[PDB]
Design an enzyme around this catalytic site. Structure first.
Site, PDB file in Angstrom:
ATOM      1  N   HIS A 165       0.809  -1.212   0.000  1.00  0.00           N
ATOM      2  CA  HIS A 165       0.000   0.000   0.000  1.00  0.00           C
ATOM      3  C   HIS A 165       0.843   1.263   0.000  1.00  0.00           C
ATOM      4  O   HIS A 165       0.336   2.330  -0.352  1.00  0.00           O
ATOM      5  CB  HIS A 165      -0.930   0.022   1.205  1.00  0.00           C
ATOM      6  CG  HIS A 165      -0.234  -0.243   2.501  1.00  0.00           C
ATOM      7  ND1 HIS A 165      -0.330  -1.449   3.160  1.00  0.00           N
ATOM      8  CD2 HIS A 165       0.596   0.526   3.241  1.00  0.00           C
ATOM      9  CE1 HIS A 165       0.389  -1.401   4.266  1.00  0.00           C
ATOM     10  NE2 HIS A 165       0.964  -0.213   4.338  1.00  0.00           N
ATOM     11  N   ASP A 217      -0.727  -7.775   0.867  1.00  0.00           N
ATOM     12  CA  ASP A 217      -0.231  -6.409   0.656  1.00  0.00           C
ATOM     13  C   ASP A 217       1.245  -6.293   1.047  1.00  0.00           C
ATOM     14  O   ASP A 217       1.613  -5.686   2.053  1.00  0.00           O
ATOM     15  CB  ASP A 217      -1.085  -5.365   1.388  1.00  0.00           C
ATOM     16  CG  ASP A 217      -0.702  -3.937   1.023  1.00  0.00           C
ATOM     17  OD1 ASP A 217      -1.195  -3.434  -0.006  1.00  0.00           O
ATOM     18  OD2 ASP A 217       0.096  -3.316   1.754  1.00  0.00           O
ATOM     19  N   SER A 235       2.969   3.472   8.394  1.00  0.00           N
ATOM     20  CA  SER A 235       2.697   2.173   7.792  1.00  0.00           C
ATOM     21  C   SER A 235       3.998   1.393   7.649  1.00  0.00           C
ATOM     22  O   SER A 235       4.934   1.839   6.983  1.00  0.00           O
ATOM     23  CB  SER A 235       2.021   2.363   6.442  1.00  0.00           C
ATOM     24  OG  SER A 235       2.878   3.049   5.548  1.00  0.00           O
TER      25      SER A 235
END
Lengths: 48, 151, 52
Positions: free
Chosen positions: B29, B51, B103
């Site tokens: 992502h 992901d 993230s």
């Protein structure tokens, strides 16, 4: 003489067996290939 | 910097990404690239079901690696904004205290060994939970609680 | 030529599987921080074979 009037979907003496061998050729192994695609789609999707 | 190494790109905060073991991590992502140069050339491989983007540790960090484990007892776990008490199987924070732009962030143990990698987060109280990819006996799995917003 | 067609059909499915096969070699193996393999590639047998 009119028995000579033949179509195109006619019949061999043995190549029906040969196309049995070819239709039953590598279709089975790619059915196995599709099966293991179904297997690897279940990386975490099975038992809860 | 205990052993804390970073990803940045173009002005946007690309979350966090550090090398560990054999692979420099990269979440799928995350858009953009590394801030550094030497890391900014190698290949990736995408994982929609988890992901990720596969990315290999180069040999120039032989003296610069970062150890880790897959040991998950509960209690306190130090991170670059203090402490996440991973307890009850739950690596919660008091709600909202983290910043977006995180993230892929390396949480480590009580002595500097990377335990998990966080992606998202949500809240139904004073309890923000997180969405985290882990590796049980080095077997990676993404875990998404309901409501994970991108950091 | 149709015979050639079906064989160039059929293995296409197979090589599509082979595509997915490699796409599912890395699916247990992707950013795996130790990337450990007792038997993970001893059964695919593409790379990383131990002794015996």
């Amino acid at each position: 003489a009119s028995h000579t009037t033949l179509g195109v979907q006619d019949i061999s003496v043995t190549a029906m067996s040969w196309v049995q061998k070819i239709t039953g050729g590598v279709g089975l192994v790619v059915a196995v290939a599709a099966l293991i695609l179904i297997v690897v789609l279940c990386v975490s999707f099975s038992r809860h | 910097n205990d052993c804390i190494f970073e990803v940045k790109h173009e002005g946007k905060v690309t979350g966090y990404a550090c090398l560990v073991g054999d692979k420099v991590m990269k979440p799928a992502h995350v858009k953009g690239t590394i801030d550094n140069a030497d890391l900014a050339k190698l290949a990736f491989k995408r994982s929609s079901k988890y992901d990720l983007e596969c990315a290999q540790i180069p040999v120039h960090m032989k003296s610069d690696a970062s150890k880790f484990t897959h040991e998950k007892p509960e209690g306190y776990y130090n991170w670059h904004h203090g402490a996440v008490q991973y307890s009850g199987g739950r690596f919660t924070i008091p709600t909202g205290a983290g910043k977006p732009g995180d993230s892929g962030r390396p949480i480590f143990d009580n002595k500097g060994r990377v335990v998990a990698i966080v992606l998202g987060g949500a809240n139904e109280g004073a309890r923000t939970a997180l969405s985290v990819v882990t590796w049980n006996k080095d077997i990676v799995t993404k875990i998404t609680p309901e409501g994970a917003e991108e950091w | 030529s149709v015979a050639s067609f079906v064989l160039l059909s059929m293995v296409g499915v197979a090589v599509g599987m082979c595509m997915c096969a490699r796409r599912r070699c890395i699916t247990p193996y992707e950013l795996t921080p130790g990337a450990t393999v007792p038997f993970l590639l001893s059964l695919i047998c593409c790379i990383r074979t131990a002794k015996a």
